[PDB]
Amino acid sequence: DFEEKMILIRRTARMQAGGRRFRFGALVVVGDRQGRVGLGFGKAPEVPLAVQKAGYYARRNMVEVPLQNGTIPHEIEVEFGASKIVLKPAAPGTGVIAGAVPRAILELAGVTDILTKELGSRNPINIAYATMEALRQLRTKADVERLR
């Protein structure tokens, strides 16, 4: 099976007569380190549920990510509205030179060597959703040729 890492736990708060009433939310990345990843963000009235829920949604939503000696094929830039992830491919000696949100979503997909950067809003939650949709936008000399 898969490996889990909680990436972001956070208490929110909502208002109601006499009291602010909370609810927690957790963003979790899940991956095999050999090629699949996934991410889901879930919110229960208690921390540990919402973590598990984040997991539930984690596996309910996964990603190809066509590794290549542990790096990615092409360099890729995606914007998830104001937040902006950039991935660059790195030679077999480097390492994962990423943030913390992109560190996880890249380590669990089994990226071993990468150059990256977080221009734009460096908000975790959108930097997350951004790193994913950029992964799931990777292609190969294959699928290019297949398409042409």
């Binding site: 094929p73 092409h74 491919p89 190969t140 000399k141 290019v144 040729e145 398409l147 042409r148």
Partner: protein, 137 residues
């Protein structure tokens, strides 16, 4: 019209994103020469020298992927990305060693030269350089 090229790539861009089977772009020899590349490179099906109200156009035949599964059945694109590099505002000119390398191989830079309208692979082997006309992937 200020940049006939940008116009065309944008005729072509705007076209595909709503999956127009074709789109026609007013014609020039230079214009054709780039299309002639798009085709040859798997980006478009190809093109023919049509005519609207007696006006010499080019009809570009667009090309996509399969219908897909899920709630967004729209195909992926064949030209995912196309944009002017050199420009009337700012000429870009690269010498051969200056020549860029689009999407780690998977894409191209079409670049005018004193030896035809080549691609990056093409000029790098031909040993020349010129005006970075655009980029496709």
């Amino acid at each position: 019209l200020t940049d006939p090229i940008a116009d065309m790539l944008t005729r072509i861009r705007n076209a595909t994103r709503v999956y127009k089977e074709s789109t026609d772009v007013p014609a020039s020899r230079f214009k054709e020469e780039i299309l002639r590349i798009l085709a040859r490179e798997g980006f478009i099906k190809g093109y023919e020298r049509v005519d609207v109200d007696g006006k010499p156009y080019l009809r570009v035949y667009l090309k996509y992927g399969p219908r897909r599964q899920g709630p967004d059945p729209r195909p992926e694109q064949v030209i995912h990305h196309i944009r002017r590099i050199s420009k009337p505002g700012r000429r870009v000119y690269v010498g051969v060693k200056e020549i860029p390398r689009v999407r780690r191989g998977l894409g191209i830079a079409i670049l005018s030269t004193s030896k035809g309208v080549l691609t990056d692979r093409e000029a790098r082997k031909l040993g020349v350089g010129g005006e970075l006309i655009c980029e496709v992937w």
